[PDB]
Enzyme design. Structure first.
Site, PDB file in Angstrom:
ATOM      1  N   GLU B  73      43.008  33.789  31.190  1.00 54.82           N
ATOM      2  CA  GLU B  73      41.634  33.334  31.349  1.00 54.82           C
ATOM      3  C   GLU B  73      40.773  34.369  32.073  1.00 54.82           C
ATOM      4  OE1 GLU B  73      44.331  31.199  31.927  1.00 54.82           O
ATOM      5  OE2 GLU B  73      44.011  30.281  29.971  1.00 54.82           O
ATOM      6  N   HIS B 100      35.092  41.145  49.199  1.00 55.98           N
ATOM      7  CA  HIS B 100      35.347  42.537  48.814  1.00 55.98           C
ATOM      8  C   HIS B 100      34.862  42.863  47.402  1.00 55.98           C
ATOM      9  CE1 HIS B 100      38.706  43.554  51.958  1.00 55.98           C
ATOM     10  NE2 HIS B 100      37.708  42.872  52.493  1.00 55.98           N
TER      11      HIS B 100
END
Ligand SMILES: O=C(O)[C@H](O)[C@H](O)COP(=O)(O)O
Ligand SMILES: O=C(O)[C@H](O)[C@H](O)COP(=O)(O)O
Lengths: 157, 157
Positions: B73, B100
């Site tokens: 996915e 991040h």
């Protein structure tokens, strides 16, 4: 004996050196795309795109990209045409990456596992065969077709 | 409050309905991209491509794609231009994806967690801010330039 291209920034550098050494002792052929030394400020994308690009251009080869979490690294590798990079955080997900997704690459976070846990993930990745099952190939072909045209396929209802 | 686009095949369908209900109760606005019903033979790519496309084209929104492991996915979502989809398998990796990687989406494996564990992963994802730090933005920009030109950036040395 599998050929494996390896990429890593500073956060995954030390783990990458342990994996190269581990792959040699288990009969495989590791090739280092960088980083070749520790550099605290270096950027992951160039190393991950190097490994993924080279993996796609060398059919039958595999790839491993290393960072802190491995997530920025798998994202970068997935931008390369023809590449499929799963995040492996366990023996099961590493094996299912091969069996279901036919993933040529995996990301691994060096800050997420011990050395022994990361090497067991690598083992499952390089020994688990791709299943060639019809539904899995059908899904890979649909995604590849989107990668070709960037025209989103219609949802089934 | 945030719009969150959700996609899933049969393997992530039951967990997707549970996440939609949890997001309504925590003040968010979930939008179902499919599958709307359980179809055991349906294919994940179209649902993930739809969720990732709509997330990138909608400023301030996030997205979640569900499967068995979540790896097929996130791979499909990462082929969409502009999208960055991490694989979240913990509270730490869901938060780091935002902090991040500035990831607009995450993949979650419904077969890998309990319901309670998966909802805690979603909570960390929708509440952790993007840090906007210099080095993080620099790496996102390197990857976006590769998406535009497909010119592999040079490895240091
Ligand atoms: O997880 C990643 O994708 C990167 O390796 C991580 O963000 C690096 O962070 P730093 O070591 O610069 O704190
Ligand atoms: O996790 C994935 O990539 C897919 O959801 C998984 O391969 C679906 O497989 P199935 O449910 O058809 O066995």
């Amino acid at each position: 004996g599998m050929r494996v291209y390896l990429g890593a920034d500073h956060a995954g550098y030390e783990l990458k050196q342990r994996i190269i050494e581990h792959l040699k002792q288990t009969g495989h052929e590791p090739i280092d795309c960088g980083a070749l030394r520790y550099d605290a400020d270096d950027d992951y994308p160039a190393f991950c795109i190097a490994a993924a690009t080279r993996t796609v251009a060398d059919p039958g080869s595999l790839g491993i990209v290393l960072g802190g979490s491995g997530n920025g690294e798998q994202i970068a590798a997935n931008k390369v045409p023809g590449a499929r990079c799963a995040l492996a955080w366990s023996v099961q997900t590493a094996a299912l990456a091969r069996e279901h997704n036919n993933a040529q690459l995996i990301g691994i976070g060096g800050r997420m596992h011990t050395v022994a846990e990361a090497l067991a993930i690598v083992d499952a990745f390089v020994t688990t065969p791709w299943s060639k099952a019809q539904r899995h190939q059908r899904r890979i072909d649909i995604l590849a077709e989107y990668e070709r045209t960037h025209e989103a396929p219609p949802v089934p209802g």
